[PDB]
Ligand binder design. Structure first.
Ligand SMILES: Cc1ccc(Sc2ccc3n[nH]c(=O)n3n2)cc1
Length: 343
């Protein structure tokens, strides 16, 4: 179990002003720290956020959070469930800012909600330094869906504060799971995100912001556009046929030729955006499954599981390694052509 700690700086809050926090299970003796960003979409205006507060309040408030949580998947401490970092210090950061981890705006007389996702990450890191993070060799910032995009938006800022805070020895790396999206045409019929960013006062990485410039920061929410601007090593996990991608594309699954070509082209576009991502794991599956599920070990690409690929990535960060690959992108063109896809 990971134990809840509400942030000591109570000005860094969830949407409704309650304190943000993190769940922590220390593994002393281990110099590895895994900080996982929870996902859960976002909200982009007052009415849309009001609706999320009725029926998704845990994503907007810490008032009802549990004491503890069980680490699962990559957050598990059992070596059978987590061959990769079972012995690491485990941190689960709940998503309660509804801003894809990009916000830096408080509640005020003018703001019904606070959007502080970018500041929550900074404050968690700062408070963890007094709890052993100061001794880390590697800080892996990981996350799924909205948290996966959050990794891409925040990994370089975490590296920056640790350097500014006087900890240049900590190697900051990113693991973005299911947060790598395409701004493509729907099969049948960006604006919510563009409206979201203005509503949250959202912030994007500095190099990406300087390329796309004022009013175009939404581009930095798309992995293939923000990734090349990043300095920290980032491993990208993305289903070729991600269910959230297909949902926003208005695809729900006999398939006729128009939809067949659309689905096949989407997988190829995906595959193409990962061509120059050296550390990646992209199985040809239709799925919404994420890396904190207990059976995350089962999927393989070209015979290599994700826990193995991540270990090979670790070795690469000490010229490809014999028998221990890091770039694993399926080439077959249809959902579940890979026999190991989740059922
Ligand atoms: C471009 C972009 C748009 C939305 C998000 S946020 C998101 C996207 C999928 C998804 N599936 N399940 C879940 O919670 N999410 N959240 C991130 C980037």
């Amino acid at each position: 179990d990971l134990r809840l700690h509400l942030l000591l700086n109570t000005s860094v809050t969830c949407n409704d002003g309650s304190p943000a926090g993190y769940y922590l299970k220390e593994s002393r003796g281990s110099r590895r720290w895994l900080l996982f960003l929870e996902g859960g979409w976002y909200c982009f205006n007052r009415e849309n956020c009001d609706s999320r507060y009725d029926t998704m309040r845990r994503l907007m408030s810490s008032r009802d959070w549990p004491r503890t949580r069980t680490g699962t998947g990559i957050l598990s401490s059992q070596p059978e469930e987590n061959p990769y970092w079972w012995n690491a210090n485990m941190v689960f950061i709940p998503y309660c800012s509804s801003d894809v981890w990009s916000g830096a705006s408080s509640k005020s007389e003018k703001n019904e909600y606070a959007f502080m996702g970018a500041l929550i990450i900074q404050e968690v890191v700062r408070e963890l330094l007094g709890r052993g993070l100061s001794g880390a060799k590697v800080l892996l910032l990981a996350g799924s869906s909205a948290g996966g995009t959050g990794v891409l938006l925040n990994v370089d800022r975490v590296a920056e504060q640790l350097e500014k805070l006087g900890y240049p020895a900590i190697q900051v790396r990113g693991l973005a799971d299911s947060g790598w999206f395409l701004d493509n045409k729907q099969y049948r019929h960006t604006e919510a995100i563009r409206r979201g960013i203005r509503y949250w006062n959202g912030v994007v990485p500095e190099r990406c912001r300087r390329q796309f410039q004022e009013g175009e920061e939404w581009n930095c929410f798309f992995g293939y556009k923000v990734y090349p601007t990043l300095r920290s090593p980032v491993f990208v996990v993305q289903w070729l046929f991600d269910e959230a991608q297909l949902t926003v594309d208005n695809v729900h699954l006999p398939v006729q030729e128009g939809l067949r070509l659309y689905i096949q082209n989407l997988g190829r576009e995906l595959r193409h955006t990962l061509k120059d991502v050296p550390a990646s794991f992209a199985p040809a599956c239709l799925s919404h499954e994420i890396i904190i599920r207990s059976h995350w070990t089962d999927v393989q690409v070209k015979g290599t599981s994700l826990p193995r690929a991540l270990h090979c990535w670790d070795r690469s960060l000490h010229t490809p390694l014999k028998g221990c690959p890091v770039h694993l992108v399926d080439s077959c063109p249809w959902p579940h052509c890979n026999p190991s896809c989740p059922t």
